[PDB]
Amino acid sequence: MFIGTIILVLSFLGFVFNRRNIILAFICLETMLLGINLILLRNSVLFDDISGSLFAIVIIILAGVESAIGLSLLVSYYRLRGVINSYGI
Amino acid sequence: MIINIVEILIFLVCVLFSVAYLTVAERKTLAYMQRRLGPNFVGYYGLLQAFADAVKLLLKEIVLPKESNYIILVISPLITLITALIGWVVIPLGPGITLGELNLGILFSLAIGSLGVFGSLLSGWSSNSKYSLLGSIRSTAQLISYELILTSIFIIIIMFVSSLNITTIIETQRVVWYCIPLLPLLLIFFIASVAETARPPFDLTESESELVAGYFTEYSGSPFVFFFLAEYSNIILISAFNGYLLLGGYLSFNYSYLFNILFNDYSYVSFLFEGLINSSAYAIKLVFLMFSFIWVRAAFPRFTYDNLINFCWIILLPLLFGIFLIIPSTLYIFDSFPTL
Amino acid sequence: MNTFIIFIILIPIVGFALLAVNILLAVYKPYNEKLGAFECGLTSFNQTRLAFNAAFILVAILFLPFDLEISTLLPYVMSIYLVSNYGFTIVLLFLLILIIGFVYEINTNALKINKHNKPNTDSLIYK
Amino acid sequence: AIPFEALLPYGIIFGLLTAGGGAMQVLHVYRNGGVRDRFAIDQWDSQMMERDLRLNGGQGRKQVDQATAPEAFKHNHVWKSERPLI
Amino acid sequence: MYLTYYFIEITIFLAILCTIFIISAKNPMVSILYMIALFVIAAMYLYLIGLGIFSLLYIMIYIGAIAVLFLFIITLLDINSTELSVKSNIRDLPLVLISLIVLTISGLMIYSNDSILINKLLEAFGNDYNTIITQDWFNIENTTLLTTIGNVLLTNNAFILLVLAIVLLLGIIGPISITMKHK
Amino acid sequence: TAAGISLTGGRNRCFSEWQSFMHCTAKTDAKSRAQCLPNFEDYMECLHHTKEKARLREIESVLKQKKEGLEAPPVKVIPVKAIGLV
Amino acid sequence: MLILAIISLITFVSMSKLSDNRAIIRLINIYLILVLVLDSFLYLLFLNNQTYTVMGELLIFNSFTFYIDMLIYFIMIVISSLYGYNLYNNNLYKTLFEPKKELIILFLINILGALLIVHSNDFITLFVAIELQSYSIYLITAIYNSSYKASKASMLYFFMGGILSILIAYSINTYYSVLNSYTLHSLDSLIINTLDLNLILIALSLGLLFKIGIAPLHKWLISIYENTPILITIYISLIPKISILSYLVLSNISINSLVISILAILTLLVGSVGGLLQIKIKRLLAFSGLTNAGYMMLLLLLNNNEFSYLYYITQYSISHLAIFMIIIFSIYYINYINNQYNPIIYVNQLKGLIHDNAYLVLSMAIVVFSFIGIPPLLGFFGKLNILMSILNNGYYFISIVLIVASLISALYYLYLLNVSIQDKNNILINSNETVSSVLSYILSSLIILITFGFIYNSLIIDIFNVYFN
Amino acid sequence: PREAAAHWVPFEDKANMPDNVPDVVEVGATSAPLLSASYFIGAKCKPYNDDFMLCREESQGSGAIDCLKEGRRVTRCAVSVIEDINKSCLDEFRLHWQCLEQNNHQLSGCRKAEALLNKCVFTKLNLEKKIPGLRPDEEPVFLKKDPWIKPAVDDFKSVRAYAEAKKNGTL
Ligand SMILES: CCCCC/C=C/C/C=C/CCCCCCCC(=O)O[C@H](COC(=O)CCCCCCCCCCCCCCC)COP(=O)([O-])OCC[N+](C)(C)C
Ligand SMILES: CCCCCCCCCCCCCCCCCC(=O)OC[C@H](COP(=O)(O)OCCN)OC(=O)CCCCCCCCCCCCCCCCC
C-alpha cells in the first residue's frame, strides 16, 4: 500500500504546488489515478477476488475518457488565446 | 544455463542477419521490377552489401544541431531500436519454440507495437522546427490511426480461439487457416500492415513533407543505423504477425505418412528434420510476405494526408464495424463458441 | 533464469555497443555552419507559434475513445464460451451504442478538412 | 526467366530462419531430455509438473510409473512461503 | 537467491524518485517522459505482485493512448513554463513539509481498526510475516484473470458495461462538439 | 454483483466465513445482532489476520530470548531446483 | 426512456441543419412531458415503502428515488422550454439566447448520469455515474466556447472536479480495503459499532459534498456560476445539488458527524455573510444556493429525514427556477446590455422594474419572500419541516445558527426588492412585441405553485404516509 | 488458489503423521500414467470419490481432519486400479502414456494407442471408458472416424502396433 499511497500523496502535492505550467497539473492528475489503481489491485490480490479488479478495469477506461475530454477542453481554452500562461488559467 | 544463452545467441544472430539481407533483397527485386540489376559489386553476387552500408555508416560522425536536445536525439534511436526488436520473443518457430513462452503472447505483441509510435513523435521535438514538428504530427496521427484497425483485426481473430497464447492459435489453425474463411481480412490487414510501418504506398513523410528525408532528415551515423534497422525489423515483425494469426504459422501439410515411411523412432535427427520443415513453412510464408511489401512499393504513387485519414476512418473502419457484428453472429447462429 | 529476460537485457547492450562504437570511432570536428537545422540549403527565421487545423488535433483526441472500446472488447473475447447466448447480446448492445456515436462522427464530417479553393460559384449578373 | 540473383538473398533469409528453427528445436529437446515442449501450461498443468518433479526424484520429466510411491515421497512435500508484498 | 528479495521495495524507491523528476523539470515534455517512465515502474510492480495481465494493459492503454495524446498536445500548442527557482517555492516549503507528514501518516492510518490512534499506525508496519501458499486441486480449467473479468463485466455487471458505453459515447461526442465550429 | 467471485471465478478466500455470517444475519432480527458478533469477528480476522499476527509476534518475542532456540522437528528450506533431490 | 431519447436524438441531430436545432428541442420537450403523463402510474409499485433492487444488487429503486426522478424530469421540461422557445421575435434575442447543435445531447446524458446516482446501490455505479455527470457539466460549461469566461470556468471546473473525483475513488477503495464489499447495505447497524468506519464514510461524504458548494471550498463554484452564461448556469447549479444530495440523504453514513456539523455551521455562516456586499446578480443568487445547500447538510446528520428533504427540494427547485426565469424577463427593460452570453449582471440594472411590467415585480416579490421563509409561501413550510427534524434530534446549537443565518440571508434577498421597487425616470409606455405565451405561462405556473401550494400540505402528508411507511 | 509470486521460498518439514491416523499407500504415478488411467480410476472408484467429496461437503470447514477416513479409501482403490492395469497390460498402457509424453499430454494426439488400451482393459480388467453428461444422438469424440483434429506426428510404435492388431484380427 506504500507505493500507491506514496504515488498518490507526492502526485497530489505536486499538483497543488504547481505554479509553473498546466501540463504538469494534468500529468499529476494521471499519476494520482495510477496510485489509486495500485492500492486497489494489491487489495484484490490479497483478498483473492477480481472484485477490486472489476473496479480497476472500469476506472482505467474512465481515466482515459477523462484525459480525452479534458484535453479537448484545453484546446478550447487555447483557441481564443494563442498562448497558455505559466502561472495558470 | 549454457543451453538458454546459446539459443538466444543463435536466435539473435539469425534475426539480426535476416534484417540486414532484407534490404539487399529489396534493392535486388526492386531493380529487377524496373529491369536493372541490383548490387553486384560488393560480394560475389552482391551479398554483404548491407555490411558495407553498416560499416561505413558507423564511421560517419554524429552531428547534433543547435536547436536540438542532444539526449532525446540519441535516445529515440535506442528506444525505437529496442521496441522494434523486443517483439521478436513471442513468435514461434514451431510448437512452443519461442524465446519466452507466456500465456498471453498477443497482448504482449500488441503492447509493443503500441510503444513504437513514440520514436516518431518524440523525434519531432528534438531539433524543434515548425516545419519538422508538423511533419511529425502528420506521421504520428497516421501511425496511431492505422494501429487501431490493426488491434481490431487481432481481436476479430482471437474471437475464434479465445486464447491469447500464440502457439495455441497455430495449433487451432491445423484444421483450416484463417485467411481462407476471412479473405477480405487478409487484404485489409495487409494494407494496415503497409500503413503501420509507413511504407511508400502509404507514405507522406519521407518524400512529400517539408523535410526531404522524413522526420529523421538531420541525422548521421548511429542515429540513422538504428532507425534503418528498426524499420525493417518492423517489416518482418508485422510480417510475423500476419504469419501466425492469418496464414499458417509453421503449418504446411500433415506429414505423418512421410514420417511413417522415413523414421522408426524418436531421435535427434527426427526432431531436427521436423524443426526444419516447420520453420521452413514459417519462413516461406514470411518471405512471400516481404516480397509482397516490396512488390506493392514498386507499382504505386502515394497519398495525401486527407486521402489517408478519409481512407482509414470513413471507409475501412465502418466496414470493420460490420465485421464486428457479422462474425460473432455467425459463431452464434451455429452452435459453436470457442472454449478456453 | 529463463531465456525471456536475457533478451530484454540483451537488445540494449547491443544498441549501447553500436552507439559506443560510433562515438569512439568517428571524428567529431563541428563548427557553426555545420550546426543548424536543414531546410533545403536555406536558413530562415522560424515563427514562434503557428496555427493548425482542428482535424489534426481531433484525430488523436478522437482516437482514444475508440481505443478504449477495442480494449473493452478484449475481456469478452476470452470469455466468449462461458457467456453463451447472453453475454453475446450484451456485447451486441455495447457495440451498437458505440456505432451510433460513430455515425454521429461520420455524419458531422469531423475529420475532413475543407478546401477554400472555390471555383467562383456566383455567375455574372450585370448592371 | 526467374533471376537467381534476386532470389538469392531470399534464399539466405529462408536458410537462416530454417537453420535457426531447426537448431532451436534440437536445443529444446536436449533441454527436456529427448521429448517435446509443452506449449500451453494450465495452472493444473503447472501444479502437476511440480508434483511429477517431486515423484520421480530430481529429474524434470522422467515420468516414472510405479504402483506405490517411495518413502521420501511423503516427506519431501513443499509449501511456498510468499513475502509480505508491501 | 536472496538478491531477488528486495525488488518490490526497489520499485517503491524508484517510483518515489520518478515523481521528483516529474514535478521539477525545466522542459515540460521531458517531465511527461518521466511520467511514461512512472507507468513503466507501475507495470513492473504489477508483474512483480503477480498480475502480469494488467502490466500489459497499462502499457497498452496508458502509455500507448493517454501519453501519446499528451505528447501530441504539447507539440503543436503553446505552453509557457517557469523553472523551479528557489525564490518562488521556498515560501511553499513549510506547508509542503506539514502536508507530507500529515497526508502520508493519515493515508497509512485507515487500514486498521483500533480505537487508539497510535495502534492504527503500527499495524501498517507489521507485515514481515510470510504468507503460506497451499496447492488446492479444485480448479479444472484455465480460467485466467481476464476470463473472469469478461464473465463479471458481462453477466453480473452488464449494466456497468452499458453505462460505460454511454460514457465512451460521451467521450466521442464531447471533443467533437467543442472543436467543430459547425458552418 | 461480484460479491464472492474469486480470481479464477471461484469463491474467494474468506467466502465461507462471510457466508456463515450471512447465515447468522438471515435468521436474526435487529436488537438481537449482539449474538452475531463472533461470526463477524471471524470474518474480519479472516480478511486481515490481525489476531494471527498478534499471536505470532507473541511467540516470536519468546523465540529470540532462548539460547537453545529450537528443540523440535525442524523445517528445512530448499532451493527451487531441488524439490525432489534426495 | 432517456436511453432511447439519446440514441434516437444524436442520430437525428447529426442529420439536421443548424437552423433546425431550436425546433429539435421543442420535440424533446414534448417527449419528456409524455414520460411524466403516460408513465407516472409506476408509483403504484411502491406501496408501503416497498423497495426493489434491479440488475443484481446494482440499482435500488424506492419511491424516494422515484420522486427525485419525477422532479428532475419536471425541471428539465422547464429548462428545455427555455432553450427551445423564443423569448421575443427580435433581431436581438436570436443572437443572445441561441442553442448549440449538441446542447440537448449533453443535457440528456447529464440527466442520465444524475439519475444513475439517486437510483444507485453499488459504489462503482456511483463512481461511473458521478463521472458521467461530471463530464457532462465539463462540456455544458465549455460548449459556448466563444467566450473567455466560460472557457476559463470550464478549465477551473475540470481540475477541481478531478480532485474531488479522485477523493471519492480513494474513499471507495479505502472502504474496500477493510471490507470485501461494495454496498452500504452490508453495514446493517452491527458493524458500525465494532468497526472504525467513521473516517472512511465521512471522507466519502466530504468528497461527494465539496462538489455541491460546501463552504471551505466554495469560492471556485461561485466563480463558475458567475463566469458561465445565464442559461447554462440554471442547469449546472440545480442538477449536481439535487442528485448528489439525494444520494447522500438516502444512505445515512454521516449521523452524529462532528465534521458535517462543523461544515454545516460554517456553510450557514459564510453563505449568509458572504453574499452581503455584492453587486452582481448571479453572485448574489449563487450564495443563496450556498445557504440553501447548507440546510441540506443538516439533514445528512439526521436519521429518517425523507419528509424534510423532499419537500424542501421541490421548494428550492421551484423557487430557484422561478427567480432565474424572472431575471430573464427583466432583460427587455434594462437600459444597458453588455456581454452577449450574460446580458444582465449588475443588480442595479433592474432598478425601475415596478414602473415597467409591475407584475414581474409581483412575481419577483412572491418568489423572494419564499426564500426568506414567509408563512403564506411554500418556502416557509420547507424551513419549518427542517426545523421540526433538527429540534427532534438534539441539534440545538445548529438550530439557532440556522435562524441567525436565515436572518442574515434575508438582507441580500430583500436587496432585490429594494432595487426593483424604485423610481425610474424613463418608463415604457407601450411595447410592440410581447413575451412568449407558452414560456410566460411557465413562470405563472411556477408562482401559483409557490403562492397557493400551502393548500395541499395536508393531502401530500397523507400520500406521504402511505407510500413511504 | 492463488499463485505464489514475488520471491516465494519453498520449505519442507521433516515430520510424521500422528499415531491415531493409520498409514496409507500413496500414488506414485506421474501425469501421463495418471491422465491415462484417469477414466478407469473414475470408473472403478466413482462411489468412493463421491463419498469423499460428499463428506467434505457435509462437514463444512471441518474439511481436512473429519473426512480423512474416506480419503484413505479413494487413494487405496486408485492404487488398486493402477496395480491391476500394470499386471494386465503394462506394455499397451506404457504405449499410451509414452505417446502422451509428447503432444503436450493432449488426448487428441494418441487415438491409435488409446484404442488398443481401451480394448485390452475392457477385455481383461472389464472397465469401460465413458463420458457422462452426453445425451444420445451425440457421438463420443474418442469413437469418431475422420476427426477434424489430427496430431502433427503419429508416433511410430503405436502405428506399428495398431497395424499388427489389425493383422492379428484382435481389433
Ligand atoms: C397524470 C399524471 C400527472 C403528472 C404529474 C407530474 C408531476 C411532476 C411534478 C413534480 C413536482 C411538483 C410537485 C408535485 C407534488 C406531488 C405530491 C406527492 O404526491 O408526493 C408524495 C410525497 O411528496 C413529498 O415527499 C413532498 C413533496 C411536496 C410537494 C410540495 C409542492 C406542493 C405544491 C405543488 C403540489 C400541488 C399542486 C397541485 C395543483 C393542482 C410522494 O410522491 P408520489 O409517489 O405519491 O407521486 C404521486 C404520483 N402522481 C404525481 C402521479 C400523482
Ligand atoms: C455481398 C457481401 C458484401 C460484398 C462486399 C464485401 C465487403 C468486404 C470486402 C473488404 C475488402 C476491402 C479492401 C479495401 C477496400 C478499399 C476501398 C478502396 O478502394 O478505396 C477507395 C478510395 C476512394 O474512395 P472514394 O472517395 O469513395 O472514391 C470515389 C471517387 N469519386 O481509394 C483509395 O483510398 C485508394 C486505394 C487504396 C487501396 C490500398 C492499396 C494498397 C495496397 C494494395 C494491397 C494489394 C495486395 C497485394 C498483396 C499480394 C497479392 C498476391
From Swiss-Prot, chain A:
Q: Which cellular component appears as one GO term in the record?
A: respiratory chain complex I
Q: Which InterPro entries match?
A: NADH_UbQ_OxRdtase_chain4L/K (IPR001133), NUOK/Mnh_C1-like (IPR039428)
Q: List, in alphabetical order, the GO biological process terms annotated in this UniProt record.
A: ATP synthesis coupled electron transport
Provide the E.C. number(s) assigned to this enzyme: 7.1.1.2
What Pfam families does its record include? Oxidored_q2
Give a short account of what the protein does.
Core subunit of the mitochondrial membrane respiratory chain NADH dehydrogenase (Complex I) that is believed to belong to the minimal assembly required for catalysis. Complex I functions in the transfer of electrons from NADH to the respiratory chain. The immediate electron acceptor for the enzyme is believed to be ubiquinone.
Subunit composition? Complex I is composed of 37 different subunits.
Q: Which family, according to UniProt?
A: Belongs to the complex I subunit 4L family.
Which PANTHER family does UniProt cross-reference here? NADH-UBIQUINONE OXIDOREDUCTASE CHAIN 4L, NADH-UBIQUINONE OXIDOREDUCTASE SUBUNIT ND4L
This chain belongs to which protein, by name? NADH-ubiquinone oxidoreductase chain 4L
What organism does this protein naturally occur in?
Yarrowia lipolytica (strain CLIB 122 / E 150) (Yeast)
Q: What's the name of its gene? A: ND4L
Swiss-Prot record, chain E:
An example of a Gene Ontology cellular component annotation for this protein is:
mitochondrial membrane
Its UniProt entry gives the catalysed reaction(s) as:
a ubiquinone + NADH + 5 H(+)(in) = a ubiquinol + NAD(+) + 4 H(+)(out)
Membrane topology per the record?
Answer: Multi-pass membrane protein
A single GO molecular function term of this UniProt record: NADH dehydrogenase (ubiquinone) activity
Q: Give the enzyme's EC designation.
A: 7.1.1.2
Q: What class of enzyme is it?
A: translocase
Q: Which Pfam families match?
A: Oxidored_q3 (PF00499)
Listed A to Z, the keywords are:
Electron transport, Membrane, Mitochondrion, NAD, Respiratory chain, Translocase, Transmembrane, Transmembrane helix, Transport, Ubiquinone
Membrane-spanning ranges: 3-23, 32-52, 53-73, 93-113, 158-178
Database matches in InterPro entries: NADH_UbQ/plastoQ_OxRdtase_su6, Nuo/plastoQ_OxRdtase_6_NuoJ
Assign the protein's first listed, main location to one coarse class: mitochondrion
The organism's superkingdom is given as Eukaryota
Give the subcellular location: Mitochondrion membrane
Signal peptide (from-to):
none
Q: How does it assemble?
A: Complex I is composed of 37 different subunits.
Q: What does this protein do?
A: Core subunit of the mitochondrial membrane respiratory chain NADH dehydrogenase (Complex I) that is believed to belong to the minimal assembly required for catalysis. Complex I functions in the transfer of electrons from NADH to the respiratory chain. The immediate electron acceptor for the enzyme is believed to be ubiquinone.
Give the family per the record: Belongs to the complex I subunit 6 family.
UniProt name for this protein? NADH-ubiquinone oxidoreductase chain 6
Source organism per entry reads: Yarrowia lipolytica (strain CLIB 122 / E 150)
Name of the encoding gene:
ND6
